[PDB]
Amino acid sequence: EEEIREAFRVFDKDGNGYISAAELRHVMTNLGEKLTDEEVDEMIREADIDGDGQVNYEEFVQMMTAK
């Protein structure tokens, strides 16, 4: 789970401890499959459970590590 924890730091470029839509864009675009803003938003829409629009630590953990 180390890579997941460190990933949050790699995704967060502004250094606020939060993965914003604009931040996720740069992450998922460099990945290769560059989707549209809507799809990027969709990503966090299904990656958001607390109802804030962004993915926090807990949300990131639960979404990635689903039991």
């Binding site: 998922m28 990945l31 989707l35 799809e39 990503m43």
Partner: peptide, 19 residues
């Protein structure tokens, strides 16, 4: 449904570790 794309850079992190 790009959810799997979230684990995509995540997997890349593990790949970057190998790299």
């Amino acid at each position: 449904r790009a959810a799997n794309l979230w684990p995509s850079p995540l997997m890349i992190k593990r790949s970057k570790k190998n790299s």
